């Protein structure tokens, strides 16, 4: 006997992508070599972010890029391991350099119209192997419909599952003291 509380405990994070895209497999080979033989933590973080699933890679917008393109960051390189989406609200798009997993057709058009360049993760590794003069970005993780139903209960102000919305659907008893109580 050895009297341990845990034994044969597995890891908790992904160690390889579950997707079988061949080009993604090549990209993983590239960044696995860079991360193995480079001191930059940027390579290890990008490598880990290549394994993540779609719900862990939310889209970022042009507006969100323009938000972080202020206060002396107009000359840095934007790195987003996700898709990049055009925003219809932004009327004037500044000049920027973007390295992204993929771009929408309209976002690509508006960037090159403004005078930018759209890169690729492999060209990014070819130009800045250590990631110097770059800023990494993420999308809004909790901005999903399914998250609003999480942890439903009394006094939680979450969203319930109803087949429709109206005065006949829910409300009534337990939502107003005029009919019993409130939550």
């Amino acid at each position: 006997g050895i009297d341990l509380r845990w034994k044969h405990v597995r890891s908790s994070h992904r160690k390889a992508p579950k997707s079988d895209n061949v080009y993604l497999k090549l990209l993983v080979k590239l960044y696995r070599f860079l991360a193995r033989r480079t001191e930059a933590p940027f390579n290890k973080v990008v490598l880990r972010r290549l394994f993540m699933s779609r719900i862990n890679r939310p889209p970022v917008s042009l507006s969100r890029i323009a938000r972080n393109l202020k206060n002396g960051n107009e000359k840095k390189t934007v790195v987003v391991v996700a898709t990049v989406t055009d925003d219809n609200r932004l009327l004037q798009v500044p000049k920027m350099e973007v390295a992204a997993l993929r771009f929408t057709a309209k976002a690509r058009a508006r960037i090159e119209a403004a005078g930018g360049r759209t890169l690729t993760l492999d060209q990014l590794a070819l130009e800045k192997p250590t990631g110097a003069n770059t800023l990494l970005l993420r999308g809004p993780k909790n901005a999903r419909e399914a998250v609003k139903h999480f942890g439903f209960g009394p006094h939680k102000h979450k969203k319930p599952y109803v087949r429709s919305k109206g005065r006949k659907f829910e409300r009534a008893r337990g939502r107003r003291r005029s009919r019993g109580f409130k939550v």
Partner: protein
């Protein structure tokens, strides 16, 4: 471009017409594959530079790939036949595979394959007759 040897290996890694898979190991019946193993290193039909050895009526026949005419398969093979001497063929193959940096890692396999074919073209000695151990008593009658 969008196509390369690594991508073709990615596509053909799991299944291809040349694959012979069963228990205890896997093999490949490819013309440009030495040692007849299934691996990226020895997969002739995916790499840009490859070698192949075929037995002739008297000697060895060596085929190589010309990188300049990949899209023209009718004229994409450099062929030559060696039927003079074992040592001379060994030297020619080794120089052909390790003098200008054209797959210098396959020198040992190419020479061994030529050695085996030449060994396999010699006349065979007759095997000695079999003996009996427990049926000798039965056959005594």
């Amino acid at each position: 471009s969008n196509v390369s040897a690594d991508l073709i290996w990615e596509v053909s890694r799991n299944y291809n017409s040349f694959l012979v898979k069963q228990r205890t190991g896997t093999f490949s019946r490819d013309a440009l594959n030495l040692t007849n193993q299934h691996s990226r290193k020895h997969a002739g039909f995916v790499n840009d530079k490859a070698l192949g050895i075929v037995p002739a009526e008297k000697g060895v026949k060596v085929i190589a790939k010309k990188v300049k005419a990949a899209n023209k398969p009718a004229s994409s093979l450099y062929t030559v036949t060696y039927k003079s001497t074992a040592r001379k063929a060994y030297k020619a193959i080794a120089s052909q595979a390790a003098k200008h940096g054209y797959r210098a890692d396959l020198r040992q396999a190419a020479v061994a394959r030529a050695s085996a074919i030449l060994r396999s073209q010699r006349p065979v000695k007759p095997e000695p007759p079999k003996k009996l151990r427990g049926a000798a008593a039965r056959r005594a009658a």
